[PDB]
């Protein structure tokens, strides 16, 4: 749950507003990858030919 | 000449998910095997998730890690080299005027008083914060702060606070590699209610019988989101158009407390991030000494700042 912090490229009083207002929050879904709480090293493996 | 169509900034001050544990006081110097608290279900005809300390534990311990990465002005993506070169010259001018010392002092102040304990700081009796500098897997420097003597409103002075601000300033400049471990002990009470981070789920249905409130957990251990820790230690902004008495709020473009419903720094007035940044990089107008702190704090936070054109 974050705030709307981007350039309001529409009008100040837009009839058909292509975005939302600043006093309301916006809810989003994202992917994230973390390390476990006891592991501090990351290993990356590949092969070459 | 023109603001870039794409412009993205990476995140400095990158925290991790804060893990919660419980124990007894006068045992904080050996607290490394304390049992993690767990969320439970409770019926009220609705089911809620609650958390509670054990009946033998009266002290909560919250632990997380922190990094500072340096190179604040360099963007991660761009579209024209001219705007990037002007931006680098502007931020270089700022850091040549004054290094990252005010922002680092406010960050060390927000670490000193345990403001990342959001609602479990209010009914506290005594809070103690410990901060470790991890250099090669060991401890290089330890700081121990009292959080109830260091208030929330005003920014006082202390020798160890200046030392921690020097460490964060050296990390933010680009001359060192700083990894911090932050542990906070709060004396809530014998078996009282702790407040983990509440959950947002965008797939939960509408029909009755569903859970009304679920809490956050990491492998059956009650935890706090990392973004709540970031918003907790980002509240350094106090130079806005409202009068003195409400207190400092967090650094956001069009700085807005959405929980109350108000939005300070409206774009009708010329006191938001975007217009002050545009005047700084395009029309060669520095707004004040105070607004430079706000713009550079908003660049340390990061974001997606792109005008269409």
């Amino acid at each position: 749950r974050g705030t709307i912090s981007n350039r309001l490229k529409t009008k100040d009083r837009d009839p058909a507003k292509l975005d939302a207002s600043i006093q309301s929050p916006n809810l989003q879904t994202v992917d994230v990858a973390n390390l476990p709480s006891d592991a501090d090293t990351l290993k990356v493996r590949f092969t070459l030919r | 000449l023109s603001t870039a169509s794409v412009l993205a900034f990476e995140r400095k001050l990158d925290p991790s998910d804060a893990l919660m544990s419980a124990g007894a006081w006068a045992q904080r110097d050996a607290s490394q095997e304390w049992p993690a608290v767990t969320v439970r279900e409770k019926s009220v005809l609705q089911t809620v998730d609650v958390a509670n300390l054990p009946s033998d534990a009266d002290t909560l311990k919250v632990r997380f890690t922190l990094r500072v990465l340096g190179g604040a002005g360099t963007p991660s993506a761009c579209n024209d080299a001219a705007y990037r070169d002007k931006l680098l010259q502007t931020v270089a001018t700022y850091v040549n005027e004054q290094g990252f010392a005010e922002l680092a002092r406010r960050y060390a102040h927000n670490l000193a008083n345990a403001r990342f304990l959001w609602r479990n700081r209010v009914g506290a009796e005594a809070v103690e914060v410990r901060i470790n500098h991890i250099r090669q897997g060991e401890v290089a420097r330890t700081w121990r702060f009292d959080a109830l003597a260091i208030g929330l409103r005003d920014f006082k002075a202390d020798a160890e606070l200046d030392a921690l601000a020097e460490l964060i300033a050296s990390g933010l400049s680009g001359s060192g590699h700083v990894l911090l471990e932050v542990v906070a002990f709060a004396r809530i009470g014998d078996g009282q209610e702790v407040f983990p981070s509440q959950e947002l789920i965008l797939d939960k249905g509408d029909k009755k019988g569903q859970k009304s409130k679920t809490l956050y957990s990491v492998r059956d251990a009650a935890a706090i989101h990392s973004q709540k820790i970031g918003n907790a230690l980002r509240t350094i902004d106090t130079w806005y158009p409202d009068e003195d008495g409400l207190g400092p709020i967090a650094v956001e473009p069009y700085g807005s407390v959405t929980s109350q419903g108000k939005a300070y720094r409206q774009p009708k007035q010329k006191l938001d991030f975007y217009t002050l940044l545009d005047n700084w990089v395009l029309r060669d107008e520095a707004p004040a000494v105070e607004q430079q702190h706000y713009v550079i704090a908003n660049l340390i936070r990061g974001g997606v700042f792109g005008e269409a054109e």
């Binding site: - | 965008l202 797939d203 939960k204 249905g205 509408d206 029909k207 569903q210």
Partner: protein
């Protein structure tokens, strides 16, 4: 388009992993949520997204390996 439509599609960028999409009434309420890594988890996620988000009607669509775990033409429509 009155009933809530639930679809389960397999991603071709790596095979054997599925995604679920829900549409209640003219608007998309769930878009590409991770179903699972086998047909059983995809069938379970489809029935979970049809249990909630549902009016007295719904419809489930999927491949012929995922729709074998759902009971035959009984719990697929309403």
């Amino acid at each position: 388009s009155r009933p809530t439509v639930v679809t389960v599609t397999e991603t071709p960028r790596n095979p054997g992993s599925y995604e679920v999409n829900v549409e209640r009434d003219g608007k998309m309420v769930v878009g590409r949520a991770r179903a699972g890594s086998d047909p059983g988890a995809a069938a379970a996620k489809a029935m979970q997204m049809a249990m909630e988000w549902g009016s007295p009607n719904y419809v489930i669509l999927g491949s012929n390996k995922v729709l074998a775990f759902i009971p035959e033409q009984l719990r697929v429509k309403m």
